[PDB]
Amino acid sequence: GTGVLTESNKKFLPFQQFGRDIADTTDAVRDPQTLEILDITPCSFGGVSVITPGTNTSNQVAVLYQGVNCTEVNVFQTRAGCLIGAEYVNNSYECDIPIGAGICASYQSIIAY
Amino acid sequence: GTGVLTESNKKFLPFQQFGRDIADTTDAVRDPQTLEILDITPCSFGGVSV
Amino acid sequence: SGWTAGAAAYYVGYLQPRTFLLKYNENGTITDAVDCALDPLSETKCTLKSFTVEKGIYQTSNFRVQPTESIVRFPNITNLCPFDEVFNATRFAS
Amino acid sequence: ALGKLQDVVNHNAQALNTLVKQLSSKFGAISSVLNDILSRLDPPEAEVQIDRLITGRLQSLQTYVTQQLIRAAEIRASANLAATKMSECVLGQSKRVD
Amino acid sequence: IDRLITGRLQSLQTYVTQQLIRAAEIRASANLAATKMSECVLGQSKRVD
Amino acid sequence: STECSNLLLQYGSFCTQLKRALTGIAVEQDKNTQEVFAQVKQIYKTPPIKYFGGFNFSQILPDPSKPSKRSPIEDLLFNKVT
Amino acid sequence: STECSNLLLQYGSFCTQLKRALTGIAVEQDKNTQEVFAQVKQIYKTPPI
Amino acid sequence: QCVNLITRTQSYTNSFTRGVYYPDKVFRSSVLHSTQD
Amino acid sequence: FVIRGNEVSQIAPGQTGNIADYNYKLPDDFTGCVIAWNSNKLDSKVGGN
Amino acid sequence: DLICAQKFNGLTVLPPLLTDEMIAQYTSALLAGTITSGWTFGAGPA
Ligand SMILES: *[C@@H]1O[C@H](CO)[C@@H](O[C@@H]2O[C@H](CO)[C@@H](O)[C@H](O)[C@H]2NC(C)=O)[C@H](O)[C@H]1NC(C)=O
Ligand SMILES: *[C@@H]1O[C@H](CO)[C@@H](O)[C@H](O)[C@H]1NC(C)=O
Ligand SMILES: *[C@@H]1O[C@H](CO)[C@@H](O)[C@H](O)[C@H]1NC(C)=O
Ligand SMILES: *[C@@H]1O[C@H](CO)[C@@H](O)[C@H](O)[C@H]1NC(C)=O
Ligand SMILES: *[C@@H]1O[C@H](CO)[C@@H](O)[C@H](O)[C@H]1NC(C)=O
């Protein structure tokens, strides 16, 4: 399996080796060589959205990493995700390209507001 | 396949043999004996309603 | 110095398994193309199957950090396993 | 201004194009062409290959018909609204706000 | 792997189909709510109930 | 392919179900057009002199010069939808 | 799994269809909120008394 | 008769948009075709 | 019947071969059993049966 | 741990475009227009 192996606070009983979640996917593991419980988490991932104006207008793009903090990926942190390539502007305008959570983007460079 | 082979106004490039539609359906072919282009039109069909 | 002095200039590149989007014109010649992976905008062009992308926000793919190395964890106990007692036995049972 | 009708036309054309594109899918079989599977294979596992193509094409066709049914329900709701507007805004004067 | 793909694909298509039907129901409810916003809040309605 | 149809016969009435559903959709479209547009059983005509107290309806009334007998607005709507 | 995705490529445009349907539902929800609540383009204020 | 006469220097440059070939022998007209190759 | 040793795979539905096409053809929807056993003691001669 | 199990298998929840405070600001504008101006703001100037 692929993931990160971290410290676990799960009190495994001595007979128990594997750990499973509500999804019945491998969540914790007991190493045979040293009898310690390793918490398995999937590596960092998320969805990628490309914010663009028309190609008749410009070829500049912005990238939204959805549900991803900006420390684990012009960098702006939204509730929708981490936005790269768009600068935040404190001025409020009508929504042009919807990002989410009240944030929209427009081309004027690409700004987010 | 099965279809009529009508005359084609398409000018193929000489390495190409088969031809396809926008929805990748074969619409044309070059003939190997005589280097000419033929439009493949599969045979006439219809819904019969009573 | 038995041979005439000369020079030759040539470029060498290597091929990788990539997804491309090709534009076929009305004469059948590939006139333009986009590489999907290299550019976000070009990945949007590959997703929309078009060279002109309208204004909007487009779900294209998923970012994922790749694994860096492989670790194999097996028990430390090493014992020679007696398969010779099974398969090289002179007499078997009914 | 005329986006909505164009969207309806686009959705119908896109669905039909997608359905024709689903005839090029192997669906885990050796080929997407039935005649090729006939030509390169003897019958008793060609039955399995053609069965895989048949269940893939049934899945595509049922997906298309279900999407068409949902879109038909949406268009029927829009047309019932349009008939209500024809009765109440054109054939009379309405006190209903907006 | 092909059996797992066809099972998971059928599960995903089932989920998307129920999501589309629920989206149609919620769109009908939201169109009703927009009508009530226009006719009960932005005006006085003589339609009974 | 005839043996493909022989294999398709083993799956039952799936094709009949899909054909029946699409026939229902097809008749529902014509039905929807009938409740939207066929709301009067009398085909009314405007008078030959189109004076209505200064109100101009030429952009919504049909154009006799055009073969489609459509209004200028309706002709624009038909040209702008492809 | 890379080979599982390679086998999934042989099933065609099913995943594109599911993503397109869910994107339509997702923009439909925001459209529903716009029809219900964004019925005025002026943000009116109550007087302080 | 193997004799050594050639020396060679090298630099690195940009491929730009070169190197694209026809993935098959199929005529296609005014379309967009996506291929993995 | 009696056949050659490499021809026992041809006694099967949908097989292509010499005896499958010209001697014994099985239908595609065949139901039943095939039995094969050697006959050197009875169906062979030292001068050639 | 249901949300993490959904997220780890590719099922993500997108946020709504309007936040709760913006929907509340829309309803406050509707309240203020209705109380201060009646039905007149729905048919033109308040
Ligand atoms: C009613 O409207 C039509 C169209 O708006 C008027 O026709 C225009 O008349 C002016 C002046 O005669 C011309 O310059 C325009 O080219 C006409 N437009 C078209 C589309 O024909 C018409 O004059 C108006 N009044 C009456 C009484 O019909
Ligand atoms: C080897 O594995 C056993 C468990 O099977 C463990 O008890 C022991 O401590 C391990 N030895 C070392 C040197 O880690
Ligand atoms: C093939 O045979 C035909 C028949 O004569 C001839 O016209 C043609 O030139 C030949 N060669 C090719 C490459 O088609
Ligand atoms: C295509 O073919 C026609 C006819 O041979 C030629 O005139 C034209 O220059 C070609 N190229 C393009 C881009 O149309
Ligand atoms: C197996 O048994 C034979 C005698 O029966 C012996 O000669 C041979 O060395 C044995 N092989 C192994 C691998 O023990």
H/E stretch holding D64: helix D43-85
Q: Is J12 on the interface with A (CB under 8 A)?
A: yes
Name the DSSP class of G2.
Answer: H
Nearest C-alpha in C relative to H5: C3
Backbone angles phi, psi at F47, to 5 degrees: -65, 155
Q: Does J38 touch chain D (CB under 8 A)?
A: no
User: CA–CA distance from J21 to each of A102, G30, J25 (Å)?
Assistant: 10, 15, 6
Resolution in angstroms for this experimental structure? 2.4
In this structure, are residues G46 and J30 in contact, taking their beta carbons and an 8 Å threshold?
Answer: no
Handedness of CA C74, C78, C83, C85 (dihedral sign): negative
- Tell me the one-letter amino acid at E22: R
- Comparing C-alpha atoms, which of D88, E42, D89, E39 is closest to residue J44? E42
Alpha helices in chain J (DSSP H): 2-8, 20-37
Coil/strand/helix, residue D33: coil
Distance CA A75, CA A62 (A): 10
Chain D residues in contact with F21 by the CB 8 A cut-off are: 65, 68-69
Q: Is D82 helix (H, G, I), strand (E, B) or coil?
A: helix
Q: What is the DSSP letter of D23?
A: G
Tokens of F54: 């200064």
* Sheet of A62-66, strand order: A75-77, A81-84, A62-66, A45-52, C56-64
**Residue D62: closest C-alpha in chain F:** F18
Instruction: Tell me the β-bridge partners of I20.
Output: none
Neighbour-count burial for G15-43, b at 16+ CB within 10 Å, e otherwise: eebbebbbeebbebbeebbbbbbebbeee
Instruction: Specify the 3-state DSSP secondary structure of F44.
Output: coil
Residues at CB less than 6 angstroms from ligand 2? A 32-34; C 75-77
Q: How was this structure determined?
A: cryo-EM
Among chain B residues, the shortest Cα distance to C24 is held by B22
**Residue C88 alpha carbon to ligand 5 centre in Å:** 6
Q: Is B26 helix (H, G, I), strand (E, B) or coil?
A: strand
Q: How far apart are CA C59 and CA C62, in angstroms?
A: 9
- Is C25 touching B (CB cutoff 8 A)? no
Give residues (CB < 6 A) around ligand 1. Answer: F 56, 58
